[PDB]
Every structure is written in structure tokens, then in C-alpha cells.
């Protein structure tokens, strides 16, 4: 028992990290097979970042301008291309440590692990959620660009995020591995609206189920609610409206605990209306929304 | 910017995980050089666990009774010995993935990463602290025994913990890599007192410094305090008494922010006496004590 904000083991991803330098800019790249993926802003200087013309900036670069180093091994760049906000550097050597992998575009509310890197070297790993507004609340400093987010299913790494930038609000934005930003963001140093965020209701309910499984049950009550009634409360408290699709994905947790999804909704409704009254749930004094129902099941069953 | 409960990259440790089976019991082992380390209770059945005579139970076992499998590679056991609560199985092959490593016994209040494993396979990684009462609040299910805790300094892995058991209270206990339990615990299925825990004051202050660095400053006030006065409040709120050694280790954070350690103590005193008034600090609604001053500096400077 016990419930922790657990990240996937990072080994398969550490084997793919490289350093990419172009001119005076250094950031991280991801080496999979004979391609290195990195944020296209590696080609910019600081003067360029207010409104870069990426196409023109890239035209001034040749394969030999992209210095790619895998630890201490220098990679030979034989091609380069820009795909949306990423650069793809073709190298002459396939990464011997390439795991089985997929590129996926995750949905808002889904979770993933981030391997934060600097200069091609891993510094740490943490789990987070893609906010409903497509930002992530990460831990990233200058030089972390090119660090990736991923999930692992057995031996397959699904890469879902590449870090690009920190918004003036201190939240983070990036792309899928095809270089498409999550959210409305652009890779320019301009103030950019993130838009209204909400709490991921289905994840809070999953985490309440994790709490009951792991012994914290003080919040259970004698009440029930309906989706309509619960959604009026979700509205008032800036929570995502709960749908039958969310109730369905909570089915396994509801079956395991014997607590009907709408009964757990009534516990959540009371917590929203009354607060925690100075108590905690799974070591937290707020309602946690960074665990999906799949994460709760995986953690509670011991999936490797 | 941003501040997350970050674990060390787990790759170097994933390369050391093996499955150890003895009789009907399977758990995890750590393969370093030509030795596999695992909890000695791999030799017990469930009838044995109420009060095992480990010396007698081990005498009935031969090298060929310890089945060690590294993924799909079977290891040949050429020796076995019990050292405190661990078994050391000498194998005929040195682990080719053995990183540079040390065995260390950490102090209460220090932090480390745990690579939770089942059947020799890594499931996830999380950061935690050794409580002042020598327990850890982890996420461990049956079969996680033998999972290890560690820190990494550049290319060196300092192993500090091997998981052994869950106490009836749902908290976790284990040993250093020489098999000595942290705390008063014994490897028997008996109810065991963990003893009074306290909050790690120096870590809460470090985390308040991390909050100021990362933009959360609402808790800063116009007050100061003394070690004597602060320790009267620490006493009332079950916090560890702050010493000059703790003030000294907070020196780098105090220098970086310009906030004197006793002034941060007065902010902590007011938070203890008044609560958070429904606000948060670094996404938390309680005072976090699982980040040491070294962790805050490492995370805030981007150490790889
Ligand atoms: C400070 N930091 C944290 N995580 C990433 C960074 N770096 C940046 O934000 C640099 C940057 C500035 C404008 C646009 C873009 Cl795409 C990138
Ligand atoms: C449930 N669990 C979680 N983490 C470890 C376990 N397994 C155990 O606690 C099994 C066990 C029982 C008594 C003594 C000992 Cl040393 C071990």
C-alpha cells in the first residue's frame, strides 16, 4: 500500500538523450534510430527569439553547423529538416540504445513522465499532467529545451512531449514529436495567453478511489448525486464537466471498491463545498488531479 | 522555473535489477559486480514469517535453490551468505551494467529515489525522505521487497535503502545495503512501534526558499525570530528543533535569496501558527518536508 506521484523508469529514454549545439545555442535532442529530434529554436540567437523567421534562419545552416554529441561520441549529421517546430537531424549512425517506441499526441488531462535534461545529460524524472489548457506545470530551467515527456507500455516508449518554452507566467509549453504545439503557443518570446484552466475531474475521482484503496476513507459520506447535479458544482468550482465516458473509465475502480461512481461524486461535491477541514487525503491537503484512472490501477496492481 | 518532487534518473539502477526466487517466494535483487543482494526473507514461507529463525531456514538452502534471473538471463549462484537482514548471492558473472556505486547509510531527514520493482522488473520511480522515525512513506505492494533507494552524484550511485516490509500502519521499513534496518524494525510479521515522527524543519525551510526562488512569496513577512523562540513553536507543532548546523546548510539559499535564515524561520512560525488560509505554496496546501537544502539547490541550478 501507499500512493505516490510515480514516474516511469527513465532508462530507456536516458539512452536516447543527446546534446545539440547550433551556433551559440545548446539544448537537448532525442536520438531514435538515425534521427535526432530537437526544438527548432536551437538555430536562434537571443536577438532572433522576439520574432524568428525560422525558414530563413535554417537556410543559413548546413549539416556541419549542427553539433550532436551523445555523451562523448560525436554524431555525423547527414541531413536536416524542419517539421513544424522541430528539427530532424539525420545522422549516419542508428542509436544502438533505441528502444521500441511510438510518437503519440496525448489528450489534455492525460499524464506522462518528463526526463528533465541539460546539455544532453539527464538531471531528474517527474510525473505530470497535460493541463486542460495544454500547458504543463513542470520544473525546467534554461537549457532544458528538448527534454521529453513519455509513457511506457511494457517495452514500448510512447513519446508524447518535447519541451520548448516557459511562458512569462512560469508554466511550460511544448510540442508532440512531430513539432506541433499543444495549445495555442508559438515558439517566440512574446507574452501568450494560456487560457482558462480547469481541474481534471475524472483524475480527482480516480485519486479518491486510490485513497479508499490505500486506507484514507474519512471523506466518504451517506450521499449520492447525479451527473447533472455534480456538474453544477463542477461548474462553480472550475472542474471539467463529468461525462458518461469518464464514469465508464472509472468502472474498474468502482468495481474494485464497491463505491458507485456517483456516490464518489457526492464525496467530491462535499469536499468542494466544505474543503478538507484541515485534514489530508494521501498526504495532500488539496484535491489532486495528476493521476488518471489508468495510473491508479497501474500503481495499485504493480504493473512492470 | 517550477519546482517538482523530482527523482534521479533510474537507468543506472534499472540495469542492476534481477528477480530472486527461493522456494515459493519471489522478490527483487540488486546485481552489482558478481554479487546479488536481496532481503533475507526470500527464504521464508508465510508460516515462517511470524518468527523466522533465519539461520536455520538458510541452512536448508543450497546455492542451487536461489533462482536468479536478470530479465531472461539465468545467473549461476556459486555462494550465499547472510549479512544482517540481507542475503548476498555470489554469481559467476559480473553484471556488465554495474555502474560506479557506493553503499551508504543515510541519515533521517535525507532524501532518495526509489525504483519500485516487481519480479525483477522496474515499475516506477519516486522521490521520498527517510522520516525522522526511520520509516518511509512509499508506494510498495507485495513483491516489491528488494526494491532499492539511491542517490546519484554524477556517475556514482549511492545505494542507501533496500525495501523489506510494510508495517501494519501502512508505512515502510527497510535496511541499508549491509542489511541493517533503519529504525527499530525486525523482519518478522509482528506489530512494531514506529515511534513518534516529526516534520523535517530544515527541509521545510529549504522548500520555502525554493518557493521564493520560483515566485511564491505571499508567506514572507515583516518579522524575524531567534532559534530559541522558533524552537518553542517547533516543539508545539512537532517539528525537529532547528540547530546552527541546519542554519549553516541553509546558507547557500539564504545567500541566493537575500532572506536571512531566522527571517525565513519567522515566516515558518507564522505559517505554523496561522495555517495557509486556503492558499498554496509550490502547488501544495501543506508545508512540504521532502526536499533537502541540497535538493533545492540541485533542482534550482540544473545539476546533471
Ligand atoms: C526558461 N526556460 C524554461 N524552460 C524552457 C526555457 N527556455 C525558454 O523559454 C527559452 C525560449 C524563449 C522563447 C521562446 C522559446 Cl521557444 C524558448
Ligand atoms: C505488503 N508489502 C509492501 N511492501 C512490502 C510488503 N511485504 C511485506 O511486508 C511482507 C513481509 C511481512 C513481514 C515481514 C517482512 Cl520482512 C516482510
XYZ file of C-alpha atoms and ligand atoms in Angstrom:
642
model
C 0.000 0.000 0.000
C 0.845 3.710 -0.172
C 0.311 6.078 -3.108
C 3.000 8.196 -4.698
C 3.312 10.534 -7.713
C 5.306 7.908 -9.574
C 7.179 8.414 -12.847
C 8.002 5.635 -15.333
C 11.570 4.240 -15.088
C 13.626 6.595 -17.269
C 16.375 4.257 -18.512
C 15.009 3.679 -21.989
C 14.750 7.435 -22.531
C 18.148 8.287 -20.949
C 19.698 6.137 -23.692
C 18.226 8.484 -26.317
C 19.392 11.836 -24.942
C 21.972 13.835 -26.866
C 23.237 17.421 -26.795
C 22.556 19.598 -29.861
C 24.512 22.818 -30.424
C 23.912 25.225 -33.258
C 25.974 28.348 -33.154
C 25.925 29.563 -29.537
C 22.759 27.688 -28.546
C 22.834 24.312 -26.821
C 19.823 22.190 -25.965
C 18.718 18.568 -25.794
C 17.896 16.259 -28.627
C 16.263 12.795 -28.805
C 18.166 10.211 -30.872
C 15.933 7.425 -32.166
C 17.228 5.186 -34.975
C 19.279 7.518 -37.271
C 17.352 10.706 -36.466
C 17.883 13.297 -33.751
C 14.781 15.398 -32.885
C 15.145 18.758 -31.149
C 13.309 22.111 -30.846
C 13.865 24.253 -33.932
C 14.774 27.258 -31.799
C 18.285 25.703 -31.384
C 19.025 27.761 -34.568
C 18.177 31.113 -32.925
C 20.214 33.632 -31.049
C 18.548 35.833 -28.308
C 18.012 38.709 -30.803
C 16.157 36.193 -33.056
C 13.712 34.957 -30.411
C 11.321 38.029 -30.355
C 10.003 37.003 -33.865
C 12.186 34.443 -35.635
C 11.774 33.689 -39.296
C 12.628 30.017 -38.847
C 12.708 29.225 -42.571
C 15.313 31.978 -43.210
C 17.309 31.174 -40.122
C 17.505 27.479 -41.114
C 18.606 28.335 -44.677
C 21.821 29.824 -43.205
C 22.580 26.449 -41.541
C 24.273 23.397 -43.053
C 24.527 19.829 -41.652
C 28.008 20.623 -40.239
C 26.593 23.509 -38.146
C 24.556 21.041 -36.006
C 26.894 19.607 -33.391
C 25.389 16.480 -31.918
C 27.100 14.733 -29.064
C 25.845 11.558 -27.361
C 27.747 11.684 -24.084
C 31.238 11.927 -25.593
C 30.516 10.333 -29.023
C 30.163 12.936 -31.789
C 27.402 12.136 -34.337
C 27.843 12.879 -38.034
C 24.879 14.908 -39.426
C 23.991 13.947 -42.994
C 20.622 15.746 -43.335
C 18.389 18.296 -41.667
C 14.790 19.254 -41.971
C 12.226 21.276 -40.106
C 8.820 19.694 -39.385
C 6.544 22.193 -37.642
C 8.525 23.365 -34.522
C 11.059 20.512 -34.506
C 14.211 19.875 -36.386
C 15.050 16.358 -37.548
C 18.779 15.809 -37.952
C 19.581 12.682 -39.915
C 22.730 11.085 -38.553
C 24.915 8.364 -40.073
C 24.579 6.025 -37.039
C 21.417 4.449 -35.658
C 21.223 4.786 -31.870
C 22.166 1.336 -30.532
C 20.069 2.108 -27.436
C 16.859 2.887 -29.425
C 14.033 1.284 -27.512
C 10.748 0.163 -29.113
C 8.907 3.470 -29.461
C 5.913 5.367 -30.815
C 5.173 9.052 -31.250
C 1.763 9.905 -29.788
C -0.207 13.075 -29.280
C -1.738 12.922 -25.816
C -5.040 14.386 -24.785
C -5.389 17.142 -22.173
C -5.883 15.556 -18.737
C -3.523 12.656 -19.582
C -0.305 12.129 -17.609
C 3.283 11.389 -18.540
C 6.801 11.337 -17.165
C 9.361 14.015 -18.001
C 13.070 13.350 -18.057
C 14.488 16.811 -17.436
C 17.882 17.196 -19.155
C 20.604 19.833 -19.526
C 23.395 19.627 -22.163
C 22.180 16.147 -23.189
C 22.517 14.841 -19.604
C 19.556 13.664 -17.544
C 19.025 15.514 -14.265
C 15.760 14.070 -12.957
C 12.406 12.486 -13.639
C 8.926 13.525 -12.599
C 5.331 12.771 -13.433
C 2.882 15.422 -14.537
C -0.366 16.005 -16.384
C -1.050 17.882 -19.578
C -3.388 20.619 -18.211
C -6.799 21.040 -19.855
C -5.361 24.332 -21.221
C -2.417 22.432 -22.840
C 0.291 23.764 -20.538
C 2.347 21.664 -18.141
C 3.473 22.789 -14.666
C 6.999 21.382 -14.861
C 10.413 22.081 -13.455
C 12.503 23.424 -16.316
C 15.356 25.876 -16.454
C 17.181 27.448 -19.452
C 18.782 24.650 -21.443
C 16.054 22.068 -20.566
C 14.567 22.554 -24.083
C 14.385 19.287 -25.927
C 13.661 17.286 -22.710
C 10.853 14.826 -23.442
C 7.671 13.512 -21.919
C 6.688 9.882 -22.359
C 4.713 6.863 -21.178
C 5.869 3.211 -21.258
C 3.677 0.184 -22.051
C 5.849 -2.930 -21.294
C 8.881 -2.443 -23.648
C 7.359 0.382 -25.755
C 8.080 4.034 -25.145
C 5.354 6.398 -26.355
C 6.928 9.836 -26.648
C 4.274 12.493 -26.287
C 6.011 15.747 -25.450
C 9.139 17.758 -26.239
C 9.762 20.805 -24.099
C 10.099 24.154 -25.816
C 9.441 27.086 -23.560
C 8.445 28.761 -20.401
C 5.649 31.288 -20.681
C 6.022 34.588 -18.761
C 3.582 33.063 -16.177
C 6.125 30.361 -15.308
C 4.148 27.481 -16.851
C 5.514 25.298 -19.641
C 4.695 24.699 -23.283
C 5.908 22.283 -25.873
C 5.068 20.040 -28.774
C 4.293 16.490 -29.829
C 7.270 14.725 -31.550
C 6.027 15.949 -34.951
C 6.621 19.514 -33.670
C 3.006 20.573 -33.255
C 2.492 22.679 -30.113
C -0.002 21.533 -27.566
C -2.256 24.559 -27.175
C -2.151 27.921 -28.929
C 1.519 28.550 -28.300
C 4.189 29.703 -30.721
C 7.945 29.411 -30.322
C 8.577 33.182 -29.926
C 9.462 35.358 -26.929
C 6.135 37.101 -26.806
C 3.543 37.152 -23.930
C 0.987 34.430 -24.843
C -2.396 33.710 -23.239
C -2.664 30.133 -21.861
C -6.430 30.371 -21.419
C -8.629 29.199 -18.608
C -7.505 26.036 -16.955
C -9.743 23.626 -15.083
C -9.273 20.768 -12.625
C -9.324 17.276 -14.200
C -12.430 15.848 -12.537
C -12.005 12.245 -13.660
C -8.446 12.262 -12.196
C -9.591 13.666 -8.850
C -12.232 10.894 -8.664
C -9.586 8.296 -9.608
C -7.351 9.651 -6.811
C -10.281 9.458 -4.331
C -10.624 5.777 -5.315
C -6.810 5.373 -4.773
C -7.305 6.959 -1.307
C -10.065 4.469 -0.350
C -7.920 1.522 -1.572
C -4.959 2.817 0.451
C -6.930 3.366 3.679
C -7.993 7.048 3.576
C -11.779 6.968 3.760
C -12.806 9.872 6.034
C -14.327 11.776 3.046
C -16.848 9.012 2.206
C -20.368 10.051 3.062
C -24.010 8.827 3.121
C -24.855 10.813 -0.050
C -25.196 10.330 -3.745
C -25.623 12.770 -6.639
C -26.452 12.764 -10.388
C -24.172 13.818 -13.308
C -26.399 16.892 -13.704
C -26.202 17.944 -10.077
C -22.486 17.168 -9.808
C -21.782 19.176 -12.960
C -23.484 22.265 -11.452
C -20.904 22.016 -8.591
C -18.082 21.271 -11.123
C -19.103 24.472 -12.920
C -18.941 26.622 -9.760
C -15.535 25.204 -8.803
C -13.876 25.266 -12.254
C -13.799 21.476 -12.633
C -14.187 19.740 -16.004
C -17.792 18.532 -16.538
C -18.001 14.801 -15.896
C -19.342 12.693 -18.747
C -20.508 9.076 -19.060
C -17.155 8.362 -20.843
C -15.379 9.445 -17.624
C -17.781 7.344 -15.487
C -17.026 4.367 -17.769
C -13.241 4.707 -17.393
C -13.769 4.803 -13.595
C -15.632 1.436 -13.850
C -12.691 -0.768 -12.782
C -12.073 1.369 -9.643
C -15.755 1.470 -8.833
C -15.897 -2.341 -9.191
C -12.789 -2.856 -7.033
C -14.014 -0.659 -4.168
C -17.717 -1.261 -4.481
C -18.290 2.532 -4.439
C -20.584 3.680 -7.222
C -19.114 6.476 -9.344
C -21.981 8.899 -8.467
C -21.508 8.135 -4.745
C -17.809 9.107 -5.139
C -19.088 12.212 -6.969
C -21.139 13.112 -3.844
C -17.959 12.790 -1.707
C -16.171 15.100 -4.198
C -19.131 17.522 -4.162
C -18.939 17.725 -0.314
C -15.138 18.226 -0.408
C -15.572 21.012 -2.985
C -18.271 22.717 -0.936
C -16.724 22.223 2.533
C -12.989 21.910 1.919
C -10.700 19.473 3.721
C -11.342 20.975 7.235
C -7.628 20.736 7.909
C -7.377 17.014 7.048
C -5.375 15.284 4.297
C -6.006 12.621 1.645
C -2.981 10.508 0.609
C -0.652 13.110 2.180
C -2.224 16.003 0.263
C -4.198 18.958 1.655
C -5.780 19.680 -1.774
C -7.697 17.631 -4.349
C -5.076 16.016 -6.597
C -5.758 15.756 -10.351
C -2.493 14.367 -11.737
C -3.390 10.684 -11.603
C -5.576 9.188 -14.291
C -7.778 6.160 -13.622
C -5.197 4.064 -15.559
C -2.392 5.389 -13.345
C -4.310 4.470 -10.180
C -4.945 0.903 -11.451
C -1.301 0.504 -12.628
C 0.083 1.707 -9.325
C -2.405 -0.279 -7.220
C -1.746 -3.577 -9.149
C 2.113 -3.322 -9.515
C 2.408 -3.174 -13.383
C 6.064 -3.535 -14.722
C 11.399 27.809 -13.113
C 8.879 25.492 -11.442
C 9.511 23.042 -8.595
C 8.709 19.356 -8.691
C 9.251 16.308 -6.440
C 11.947 15.034 -8.772
C 13.590 11.604 -8.642
C 17.068 10.807 -10.003
C 17.121 9.191 -13.484
C 16.710 5.469 -12.773
C 18.621 3.932 -15.697
C 21.773 3.026 -13.816
C 19.705 1.204 -11.194
C 17.331 -0.499 -13.691
C 20.431 -2.215 -15.105
C 21.038 -3.843 -11.707
C 17.583 -5.292 -11.036
C 17.122 -9.052 -11.005
C 14.427 -11.450 -9.799
C 15.309 -13.794 -6.913
C 13.178 -16.868 -6.193
C 13.724 -19.230 -3.311
C 11.158 -21.934 -2.964
C 7.760 -20.283 -3.499
C 8.923 -16.743 -2.700
C 9.924 -14.262 -5.387
C 11.320 -10.796 -4.799
C 13.833 -8.346 -6.229
C 17.571 -8.460 -6.002
C 20.333 -5.935 -6.833
C 23.167 -7.290 -9.002
C 26.396 -5.332 -8.598
C 29.653 -6.878 -9.859
C 29.340 -10.655 -9.116
C 27.013 -10.305 -6.118
C 23.229 -10.192 -5.926
C 21.815 -8.540 -2.755
C 18.254 -9.241 -1.632
C 16.160 -9.326 1.579
C 16.836 -12.492 3.563
C 13.119 -13.162 3.941
C 13.168 -14.567 0.343
C 13.934 -17.877 2.181
C 10.683 -17.821 4.202
C 7.253 -19.183 3.571
C 4.143 -17.413 5.099
C 4.121 -19.824 8.094
C 7.783 -18.811 8.731
C 7.191 -15.050 8.801
C 5.570 -14.787 12.332
C 9.036 -15.545 13.923
C 11.585 -16.921 11.461
C 14.799 -18.495 12.619
C 16.759 -17.164 9.653
C 19.946 -19.088 10.456
C 18.053 -22.434 10.458
C 15.980 -21.565 7.439
C 19.121 -20.644 5.448
C 20.890 -23.887 6.445
C 18.207 -25.817 4.498
C 19.116 -23.830 1.344
C 21.906 -24.505 -1.153
C 23.232 -22.251 -3.967
C 21.002 -24.085 -6.498
C 17.851 -23.174 -4.509
C 18.363 -19.439 -5.286
C 16.983 -18.802 -8.757
C 18.310 -15.526 -10.071
C 17.090 -14.188 -13.365
C 18.234 -10.920 -14.968
C 15.423 -10.290 -17.433
C 15.656 -13.631 -19.253
C 19.326 -14.486 -18.458
C 19.643 -17.060 -15.659
C 22.550 -16.381 -13.242
C 24.621 -19.214 -11.791
C 24.850 -18.968 -7.954
C 28.228 -20.077 -6.612
C 27.935 -18.831 -2.997
C 25.475 -17.479 -0.470
C 25.762 -15.684 2.795
C 23.579 -13.759 5.175
C 24.788 -10.350 6.418
C 22.317 -8.902 8.918
C 18.904 -8.884 7.079
C 20.298 -9.297 3.551
C 21.453 -12.240 1.581
C 24.469 -11.929 -0.705
C 24.392 -14.416 -3.564
C 27.731 -14.732 -5.304
C 27.199 -15.311 -9.006
C 29.677 -16.466 -11.654
C 29.126 -13.391 -13.896
C 29.810 -9.754 -13.061
C 26.903 -7.513 -14.078
C 28.061 -5.809 -17.293
C 25.736 -2.905 -16.436
C 27.275 -2.296 -12.953
C 27.529 1.446 -12.567
C 30.074 3.183 -10.304
C 28.479 2.733 -6.884
C 28.773 3.079 -3.117
C 26.772 1.675 -0.231
C 25.823 4.445 2.203
C 23.731 4.653 5.328
C 21.647 7.812 5.095
C 20.581 9.980 7.970
C 16.934 10.546 8.930
C 15.623 13.633 7.108
C 17.701 12.842 3.985
C 16.003 12.106 0.654
C 16.459 9.484 -2.031
C 14.813 7.979 -5.080
C 13.121 4.579 -5.020
C 12.875 2.365 -8.060
C 9.839 0.250 -7.234
C 10.148 -3.214 -8.826
C 8.117 -6.425 -9.073
C 9.598 -9.772 -10.254
C 12.897 -8.025 -11.093
C 11.129 -5.529 -13.398
C 11.019 -1.799 -12.713
C 7.534 -0.310 -12.402
C 8.203 3.293 -11.388
C 10.410 5.830 -9.681
C 9.656 8.312 -6.935
C 11.466 10.550 -4.506
C 10.971 10.347 -0.769
C 12.547 11.154 2.573
C 13.721 8.869 5.328
C 11.374 10.028 8.150
C 12.945 11.137 11.439
C 11.444 7.897 12.861
C 13.295 5.810 10.193
C 10.220 4.784 8.220
C 9.496 5.776 4.632
C 6.028 6.598 3.250
C 6.413 4.753 -0.052
C 4.264 3.002 -2.589
C 5.010 -0.699 -2.263
C 2.911 -3.776 -2.798
C 3.654 -7.484 -2.097
C 6.636 -8.497 -4.202
C 8.267 -5.003 -4.100
C 10.761 -6.326 -1.482
C 14.301 -5.851 -2.641
C 13.471 -2.557 -4.468
C 16.192 -0.026 -3.658
C 16.603 3.593 -2.704
C 19.536 5.602 -4.007
C 21.093 8.968 -4.814
C 23.360 9.773 -7.796
C 26.383 12.110 -7.745
C 27.491 12.497 -11.434
C 28.258 8.851 -12.477
C 28.185 7.353 -8.943
C 25.166 5.610 -7.499
C 24.994 5.657 -3.698
C 22.599 2.902 -2.671
C 21.088 3.707 0.692
C 17.972 1.599 1.087
C 16.580 -1.855 0.324
C 12.886 -2.349 0.929
C 11.817 -5.089 3.301
C 8.370 -4.607 4.716
C 5.179 -2.802 5.299
C 4.244 -2.226 8.915
C 0.588 -2.797 9.930
C 0.232 1.053 9.846
C 0.912 1.075 6.096
C 4.331 2.756 6.349
C 7.523 1.150 5.064
C 10.699 -0.211 6.599
C 13.932 -1.492 5.214
C 17.678 -1.665 5.517
C 20.959 -0.198 4.332
C 22.786 -2.429 1.758
C 24.655 -4.173 4.599
C 21.238 -5.390 5.842
C 20.946 -3.201 8.921
C 17.385 -1.919 9.421
C 16.812 1.777 9.615
C 14.955 2.169 12.900
C 13.949 -0.444 15.459
C 12.355 -2.798 12.974
C 12.798 -6.539 12.614
C 11.966 -8.679 9.599
C 9.040 -10.542 11.255
C 5.261 -10.312 10.845
C 4.664 -8.793 14.229
C 3.076 -5.368 15.091
C 6.052 -2.996 15.628
C 6.048 0.541 17.053
C 7.499 3.134 14.616
C 7.764 5.806 17.304
C 6.962 9.474 17.177
C 7.666 11.117 13.889
C 8.372 14.800 13.387
C 8.423 17.226 10.463
C 11.895 17.873 8.980
C 12.266 21.575 9.762
C 15.395 22.224 7.708
C 13.631 20.714 4.638
C 10.517 22.850 5.101
C 12.755 25.958 5.275
C 14.646 24.784 2.163
C 11.293 24.358 0.365
C 10.219 27.881 1.465
C 13.450 29.160 -0.134
C 12.580 27.117 -3.307
C 9.130 28.811 -3.246
C 10.648 32.332 -3.094
C 13.071 31.482 -5.955
C 10.171 30.137 -8.033
C 7.875 33.135 -7.446
C 5.700 32.146 -4.448
C 6.367 34.818 -1.843
C 2.998 35.570 -0.188
C 4.172 33.954 3.112
C 7.117 36.366 3.572
C 6.502 38.765 6.413
C 7.994 41.776 8.276
C 9.111 39.564 11.204
C 12.154 37.801 12.484
C 12.685 35.273 15.283
C 15.544 33.592 17.218
C 16.488 29.857 17.256
C 15.159 29.740 20.831
C 11.814 31.306 20.019
C 11.407 29.330 16.792
C 12.190 26.085 18.613
C 9.380 26.748 21.140
C 6.984 26.844 18.113
C 8.744 23.780 16.550
C 8.097 21.965 19.837
C 4.362 22.787 19.872
C 3.950 21.714 16.239
C 6.060 18.520 16.320
C 8.847 19.927 14.139
C 12.503 18.947 14.588
C 14.403 21.573 16.646
C 16.474 23.754 14.339
C 20.193 23.886 15.064
C 23.062 26.087 13.855
C 24.159 23.102 11.660
C 20.775 23.356 9.878
C 21.116 27.170 9.584
C 24.594 26.628 8.082
C 23.351 24.174 5.433
C 20.664 26.751 4.509
C 23.462 29.341 3.928
C 23.588 28.995 0.118
C 19.786 29.505 -0.174
C 19.862 32.403 2.240
C 22.692 33.978 0.195
C 20.874 33.420 -3.116
C 17.591 34.971 -1.952
C 18.947 37.525 0.459
C 16.498 36.245 3.120
C 18.181 35.605 6.449
C 17.548 32.112 7.822
C 15.865 33.472 11.013
C 13.610 35.718 8.884
C 12.516 32.580 6.949
C 12.008 30.961 10.377
C 9.568 33.796 11.267
C 7.623 33.092 8.027
C 7.516 29.383 9.014
C 6.456 30.303 12.572
C 3.520 32.382 11.177
C 2.505 29.565 8.781
C 2.580 27.076 11.678
C 0.502 29.344 13.901
C -1.963 30.600 11.252
C -2.049 27.880 8.603
C -2.166 28.511 4.860
C -5.565 30.370 4.959
C -6.622 28.399 1.909
C -3.568 29.372 -0.184
C -0.832 27.163 -1.670
C 2.974 27.187 -1.856
C 4.533 25.488 -4.918
C 1.209 23.713 -5.599
C 0.964 22.332 -2.058
C -1.620 23.166 0.624
C 0.671 21.854 3.420
C 4.266 22.509 4.495
C 6.441 20.135 2.455
C 9.444 18.466 4.134
C 10.723 16.077 1.457
C 13.263 18.394 -0.146
C 16.623 18.914 1.494
C 18.597 22.131 1.027
C 20.880 20.184 -1.383
C 17.852 19.043 -3.399
C 16.572 22.622 -3.704
C 19.991 23.874 -4.922
C 20.384 20.916 -7.354
C 16.938 21.429 -8.814
C 17.242 25.230 -8.966
C 20.700 25.105 -10.717
C 20.032 22.196 -13.205
C 22.652 19.625 -11.942
C 23.134 16.545 -14.303
C 13.454 29.342 -19.125
N 13.019 28.069 -19.699
C 12.411 27.054 -19.040
N 12.020 26.086 -19.842
C 12.411 26.483 -21.101
C 13.030 27.688 -21.026
N 13.576 28.428 -22.076
C 12.843 29.301 -22.832
O 11.668 29.569 -22.592
C 13.597 29.948 -23.977
C 12.627 30.347 -25.066
C 12.136 31.642 -25.138
C 11.142 31.979 -26.045
C 10.625 31.022 -26.901
C 11.136 29.745 -26.847
Cl 10.533 28.543 -27.955
C 12.126 29.392 -25.948
C 2.889 -5.643 1.593
N 4.236 -5.129 1.351
C 4.560 -3.878 0.945
N 5.860 -3.665 0.935
C 6.421 -4.854 1.343
C 5.442 -5.759 1.591
N 5.593 -7.079 2.017
C 5.697 -7.429 3.335
O 5.577 -6.621 4.253
C 5.939 -8.904 3.590
C 6.646 -9.084 4.915
C 5.929 -9.375 6.066
C 6.551 -9.403 7.305
C 7.906 -9.143 7.412
C 8.620 -8.883 6.263
Cl 10.336 -8.608 6.376
C 8.015 -8.851 5.020
